[PDB]
Amino acid sequence: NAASLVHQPHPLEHSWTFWFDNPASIRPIYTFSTVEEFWSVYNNIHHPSKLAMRADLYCFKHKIEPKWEDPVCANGGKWTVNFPRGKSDNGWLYTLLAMIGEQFDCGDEICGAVVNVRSGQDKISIWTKNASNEAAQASIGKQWKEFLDYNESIGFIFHDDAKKFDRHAKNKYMV
Ligand SMILES: C[n+]1cn([C@@H]2O[C@H](COP(=O)(O)OP(=O)(O)O)[C@@H](O)[C@H]2O)c2nc(N)[nH]c(=O)c21
């Protein structure tokens, strides 16, 4: 019948899974495939301003696990921005909307995004694949900056560098 005709969900290009890691133990929590489902889920998850300290919240394409060791992420890396503790909610949102909406030019390279809640600063990173494709990675980083109205340099860290050099990994590109 008509019920599902006049209130038809609007499907996204990809399915996305939110994962959480709480203050190899990163649980998935909600998978969505439609706009409706996104908002439903985003409106029942805490925004970064009300997350607990040291929490990580991930939003990755379905079947990409948010781990350096995932074979889609393995040769990839991450653009990172910083915001003050408690002032990262809009950035997170604008980031989610940019990804699920397929707004990035080089959106093929996009794996997902993560907000890291820390005392002092919040960080949001976008994870991509093909770290060695500078042209692509620079496109994404610039464009993210433009989406966010961010006015500072951002950097990109190969997952291979992160794995090897924990604290000490340097940015390979900057935009
Ligand atoms: C994001 N991530 C972090 N780790 C490891 O877990 C640690 C968690 O560090 P953090 O909690 O990201 O920041 P903070 O400790 O400065 O507050 C990192 O230093 C990495 O050693 C990770 N280990 C794996 N295998 N995969 C991941 O995606 C990953």
Curated annotation (Swiss-Prot):
GO annotation, cellular component aspect: cytoplasm; eukaryotic translation initiation factor 4F complex; nucleus
Effect ascribed to mutating residue 94 to H: Strongly reduced eIF4G binding and impaired ability to support cap-independent translation of mRNAs. Strongly reduced eIF4G binding and impaired ability to support cap-independent translation of mRNAs
Impact reported for residue 20 to A: Reduced eIF4G binding and impaired ability to support cap-independent translation of mRNAs. Strongly reduced eIF4G binding and impaired ability to support cap-independent translation of mRNAs
Residues holding mRNA: 50, 68-69, 118-123, 163-167
Any Gene Ontology biological process: translational initiation
Keyword Disulfide bond: yes
Record family assignment: Belongs to the eukaryotic initiation factor 4E family.
Full protein name: Eukaryotic translation initiation factor 4E-1
Higher taxonomy: Eukaryota, Viridiplantae, Streptophyta, Embryophyta, Tracheophyta
